[PDB]
Amino acid sequence: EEIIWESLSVDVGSQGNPGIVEYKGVDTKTGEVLFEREPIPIGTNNMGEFLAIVHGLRYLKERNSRKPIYSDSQTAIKWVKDKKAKSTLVRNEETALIWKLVDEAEEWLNTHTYETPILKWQTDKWGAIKADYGR
RNA sequence: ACAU
């Protein structure tokens, strides 16, 4: 119903899908950018949405913050819940970096605990997530 | 269909 303003919002941006992928996390209340990942030459939207949530979990855990995370990706929220990113992206030499990062994110989820609620940003009611790339 |  209502936005939980005391939260972290994350999103992917890309040039092509598959294509160059980046992501960032912002304070939902203020829009302040709290982290941004350097562009990865080839990935998918969903891989980037997944990495963004996992990075958010790690960022909040390191700072002892109980804030929830908002994501607009139904897929990535499920992959994080499952601790398994079921991407269709070919594993080859050009996708090795994104796949390394995804594998390492899964590995982190399988070796750490968190209570962080991972919440669906309701774009249909609230507009674009505050971490959106405006593109 | 829904979500990107």
Next chain:
DNA sequence: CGATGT
């Protein structure tokens, strides 16, 4: 119009 996903 193309794509990634449940």
